[PDB]
Amino acid sequence: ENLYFQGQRFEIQQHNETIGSIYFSADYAHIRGIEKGTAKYFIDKVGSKRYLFIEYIPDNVLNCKPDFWKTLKYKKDKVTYYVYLIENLDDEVFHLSALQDMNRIPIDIADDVATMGKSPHQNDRMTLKLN
Ligand SMILES: [Cl-]
């Protein structure tokens, strides 16, 4: 698979406020917010862009604005993933940007996420700052 974030720890920011830390291993995001949590994840590079596929993290763990979760969904096996465009500004500042959703069943081919552009509302985007 894709090891772009594997072994990396980021500070999580939303609306210029720190809301916790996230550490990515081979299979899970390890979240330290109000509480600890884990989320299955994977990264897919299609063309020039990279996309983060991540399970929902509840606000009892990571207290972020709920419309951050308004994005394209991917379903592999029984786990549903929330898909984000990873933007790398300078190898320090990263964004998790929500994508446009569809009026159809979740994508079953990871690469087919590229057929969708960014969400018109980007104000609830996550900022990851590399440690
Ligand atoms: Cl796939």
| Domain residue ranges in the chain | 1-131
Question: Quick one: tokens of 122?
Answer: 């980007």
Distance of CA 108 from the midpoint of ligand 1 (Å): 6
Domain with residues 1-131, CATH architecture:
Beta Barrel (2.40)
Distance 111 CA to ligand 1 centre (A): 7
CA of 75 to the centre of ligand 1 (A): 9
Classified as helix, coil or strand, 113 is helix
Separation of CA 3 and ligand 1 centre (Å): 16
CA–centroid distance, 50 to ligand 1, in Å, is 14
Question: How far does the centroid of ligand 1 lie from the alpha carbon of residue 34, in Å?
Answer: 33
Q: Can you tell me the distance from the alpha carbon of 47 to that of 37, in angstroms, rounded to the nearest whole number?
A: 32
The 8 Å CB, 24+ separation contacts for 36-44 are 36/61, 37/61, 37/62, 40/79, 40/81, 41/5, 41/81, 42/1, 42/2, 42/81, 42/110, 43/1, 43/2, 43/3, 43/4, 43/5, 43/86, 44/2, 44/110, 44/111, 44/113
Distance CA 55, CA 24 (A): 13
Which residues are 93's β-sheet partners?
A: 129
CA of 10 to the centre of ligand 1 (A): 26
